[PDB]
Amino acid sequence: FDPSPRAAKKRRPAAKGKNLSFK
Amino acid sequence: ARGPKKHLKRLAAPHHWLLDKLSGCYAPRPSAGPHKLRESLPLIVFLRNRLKYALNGREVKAILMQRHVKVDGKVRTDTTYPAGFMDVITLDATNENFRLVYDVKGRFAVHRITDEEASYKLGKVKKVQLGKKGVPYVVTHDGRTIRYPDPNIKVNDTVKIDLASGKITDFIKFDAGKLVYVTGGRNLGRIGTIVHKERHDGGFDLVHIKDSLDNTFVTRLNNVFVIGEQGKPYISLPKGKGIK
Amino acid sequence: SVGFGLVYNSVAEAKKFEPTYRLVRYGLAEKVEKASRQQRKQKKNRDKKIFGTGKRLAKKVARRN
Amino acid sequence: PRAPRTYSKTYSTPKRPYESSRLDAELKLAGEFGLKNKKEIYRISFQLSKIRRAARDLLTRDEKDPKRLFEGNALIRRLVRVGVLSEDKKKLDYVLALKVEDFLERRLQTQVYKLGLAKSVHHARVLITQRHIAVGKQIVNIPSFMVRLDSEKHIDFAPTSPFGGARPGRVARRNAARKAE
Amino acid sequence: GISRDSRHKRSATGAKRAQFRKKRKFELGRQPANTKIGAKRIHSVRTRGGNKKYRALRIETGNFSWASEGISKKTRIAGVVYHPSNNELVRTNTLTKAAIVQIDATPFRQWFEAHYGQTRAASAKIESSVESQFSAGRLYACISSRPGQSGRCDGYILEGEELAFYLRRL
RNA sequence: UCUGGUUGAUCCUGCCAGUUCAUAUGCUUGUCUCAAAGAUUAAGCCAUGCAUGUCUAAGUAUAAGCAAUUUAUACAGUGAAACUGCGAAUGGCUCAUUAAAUCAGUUAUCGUUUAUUUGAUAGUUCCUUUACUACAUGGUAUAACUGUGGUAAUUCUAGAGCUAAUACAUGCUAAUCUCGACCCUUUGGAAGAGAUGUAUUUAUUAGAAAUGUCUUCGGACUCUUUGAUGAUUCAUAAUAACUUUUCGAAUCGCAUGGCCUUGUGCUGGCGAUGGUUCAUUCAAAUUUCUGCCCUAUCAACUUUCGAUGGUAGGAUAGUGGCCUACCAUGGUUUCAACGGGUAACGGGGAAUAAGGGUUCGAUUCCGGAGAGGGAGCCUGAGAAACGGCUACCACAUCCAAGGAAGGCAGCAGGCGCGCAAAUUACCCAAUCCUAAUUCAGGGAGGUAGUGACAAUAAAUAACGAUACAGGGCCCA
Ligand SMILES: [Mg+2]
Ligand SMILES: [Mg+2]
Ligand SMILES: [Mg+2]
Ligand SMILES: [Mg+2]
Ligand SMILES: [Mg+2]
Ligand SMILES: [Mg+2]
Ligand SMILES: [Mg+2]
Ligand SMILES: [Mg+2]
Ligand SMILES: [Mg+2]
Ligand SMILES: [Mg+2]
Ligand SMILES: [Mg+2]
Ligand SMILES: [Mg+2]
Ligand SMILES: [Mg+2]
Ligand SMILES: [Mg+2]
Ligand SMILES: [Mg+2]
Ligand SMILES: [Mg+2]
Ligand SMILES: [Mg+2]
Ligand SMILES: [Mg+2]
Ligand SMILES: [Mg+2]
Ligand SMILES: [Mg+2]
Ligand SMILES: [Mg+2]
Ligand SMILES: [Mg+2]
Ligand SMILES: [Mg+2]
Ligand SMILES: [Mg+2]
Ligand SMILES: [Mg+2]
Ligand SMILES: [Mg+2]
Ligand SMILES: [Mg+2]
Ligand SMILES: [Mg+2]
Ligand SMILES: [Mg+2]
16 A cells, blocks of 8 residues: 545647748 | 835846846846745746746736736736745636746746636645734735634645635645645755654754655755645646656 | 747737837837937926926016016 | 856967977968968867866766766767767777867868868868858858768758859859950 | 944943944934923824834823722822932932832722722721821822833832832832 | 086086066057956046936816817816825945954844735714714815015025815714523524723733433533743733824715615615735844954053943833943953054955965945045935035135035046046837836936957968979988
């Protein structure tokens, strides 16, 4: 016999990078 | 000086804030409040240097004047308000609840908690005394006065405070085998179990703490904060579980 | 090249939260015309030497001369 | 006021600068590696002296000593990464055997000469300072730039250089315009 | 002008110390209040913090306690009869703490007559000396308050060994 | 520290010759990054400019202000001035004084004050003139403003007339809780016996064999009744009075919900500012132990006029010879007292060194002290303040000679010589601080300029072809 609350679950970031090209 | 000081040089600021030495000449001097100057994190540092939501002091003031930040359930609008250990910071717009707990490095960690865990906090009993009209009260480490405590509550015990009502829900006695968190000294941030409390009358008491890895260390009683029974903390712990 | 960028959820919010100088760069606000710091401070001191509206002082000097 | 910003000297004058052997050694080093002055040799000597003093101090300590293991392993890793120390000589004893030629060997000027991009060390210096050499995607205009093992295979002519595929320099197009006229 | 700083004094060895700094407001003193018997004259003093002290410049009444009987009555002060610190205060009739004064016996006598119905018998018995004083018309009392600090000239009636000691000293 | 001589050739002892830092200065000075700016022991003297002010919906606008409007009926948008509140006790600069002093580490307040922040905290029903304001009291009152004026002169102000408050000064409005007979046996009703804030001062007081019976098997029957500290006359409570005696909301914004017996009835939301005490925080004041350079050709010092201690008082925020009165004769000292010198602010630190040591530390952080030199004060939570006041000394400006006004060891910039050295620049955008306050202010701070302070990197060229000639270099 050995004598021995959960943290909030991490979230994937809402936003991501966006790429554009021109000219 | 002829009166209280109002400025704080960056080199004289607490090291655990991690302030750039060349960013400016001054640091946010914490205002008077629940926590001591050297043991507090002003809201500007938390919002700008840690969370990075604000890019400078003006944006922090803009955020605060919108009443977006709550500290232990009450809206705070002061940039240098001294948030400290075991304080719950709520940002409803971003759906964030944070508890201020040091990591093994000894610095306040960005620790996200659930709403249910954000509904309460822990307070180390700093004093127990009868007030006027013979009404007992307890003074905690955050300066809260709570009247009509349980008669079993004594100094160095930990009371679980419901933030909505500011009343004691449960408490933990200071005894051997209890889980403790180190809130000062070079062992700041470590977690362990009490093995023995060495008593020196007229001097400083010493407590021996054993971590899960069986490493033992000695600390002054002032720096020890009971957080639960072994294997059953009453709060969620940061990554590392106070090891090393 | 590398820089920083902000995209506000509305033009009104941008006007509300952006610094004045950046709005002036973008034309969303007009540059306020003011005197130099030295002129403003000297005017402040000269006003500080006067108590009240000062019109009674003007009429008194007019009568005296 | 604002906090101080730290600084240090990167070289030290030798004990007796006028030894004839020392002057001849400096002549040979500067000629072989195309160095501008004696200050560069003094800088490399200062760095190597610090390294070898640290290695000697660590060797003084007992084997399996935590300080010895940690700091010696870090030093060996750094020396191997920069290419001065070989992979098969990963011991402090070989750190004590290092020489200034080993550090001069890794300079971007020497590498540019040896890879064949330049016909001489001085031609390599002129190419580097004139913005014709790129280590990877970055234009490097510092001859003393110390090349790592991984970077060694990525030295080439810059995309913007006339020798790297851009348009001819001003002299070439000027002469072409005069000839066409 | 008055200061309480200990720097102006000689060291324990006897050395003469040099002036470390100029006098500070937080180590000041003020003029003494030589309270004297007469119509009540009291003036307030603004002290450190917002706190206030009351200076009794003159006072002729005070609240004196009969401790054996456990009562207190407001009584006129006749005069100062003995002071242990300085006899000049007795000569000038200056009221301070520990000054032995003579007070009117009337309220205490009236209370005693009302309470005990005598001018039960066992409880009504008191010390011979105090009864002799009552016959005289004046009671010896010791001032227990500090008139220059609180503005009050309260005290208690001497009894027992203290009364005998002060009767000997008188 | 080494090198070469002094012999026919060596050893030893001597002689000869050569072998970073600081100050002052000379010449040169293209590019990138970065960074500093003392010095006559003169803490000597300063022209001029600036460096501390501050307003939210929420203390006070009939500005004879502006602008509005469904063109206004107490006001209402915005708002100079002025009152009120807060700040100006922070910051910046300098190192004169200071040798158990400051300072460093380490202690105590059971020895005290503490604006502000944060958390708690205050129904006292009644008590004769009820002859009664609480659907709300006064000028016991003024500024700004109007108007009449004095002076050469200043952030000088007089006499008269007005008018507000979160200024000043007064003052009120059928409760709750213990038991509970009797009914009734619970969600009980209550005839009746009783009790009733704080603050100040003093005295007194408290604070330390039921192992049974029955029962429904549950439970009931009698009893308990402060806490903390190593430690207290502690916290706290009680009694009797006492007080030029306090406090216990006569304040403000936004909004117009709910009950009805339909009354401009009763009730009611979210905030601001206050207010008594306690705790907390930012602080302050004292305080325990150990540690300072040279001097003994300074050996005795302190004590008459407090030196060491005792009793009492005064004063203080409070301990205490801090001061007073009366008492004793003590206290320090060759383990260096006392006196003297210091080109003595102390420390973190810097340089050198193989180690022991030696020197420097005005100078980016902490603490102390000062604002030309002594002395004393007002206000305030906090100052013995100096970009506050008053006197004296030394300097020194204006003057109509009667007076009036001074403090750059703050930022720029001058004198101190006749010989010399950064800009009398821009800005609050960053850092943070102040205010009533997101917004205003900040020579604090930042930006740039300016003698190569101390440091980093690094150009002033690279690659070829042709022609001619026979010598070029090294040792000795
Ligand atoms: Mg200061
Ligand atoms: Mg420790
Ligand atoms: Mg203790
Ligand atoms: Mg004004
Ligand atoms: Mg190019
Ligand atoms: Mg260029
Ligand atoms: Mg109006
Ligand atoms: Mg308005
Ligand atoms: Mg001396
Ligand atoms: Mg000492
Ligand atoms: Mg304030
Ligand atoms: Mg409060
Ligand atoms: Mg008038
Ligand atoms: Mg005494
Ligand atoms: Mg005396
Ligand atoms: Mg010195
Ligand atoms: Mg000096
Ligand atoms: Mg210093
Ligand atoms: Mg001062
Ligand atoms: Mg001067
Ligand atoms: Mg004030
Ligand atoms: Mg002064
Ligand atoms: Mg000045
Ligand atoms: Mg000042
Ligand atoms: Mg200057
Ligand atoms: Mg000059
Ligand atoms: Mg307000
Ligand atoms: Mg400056
Ligand atoms: Mg050139």
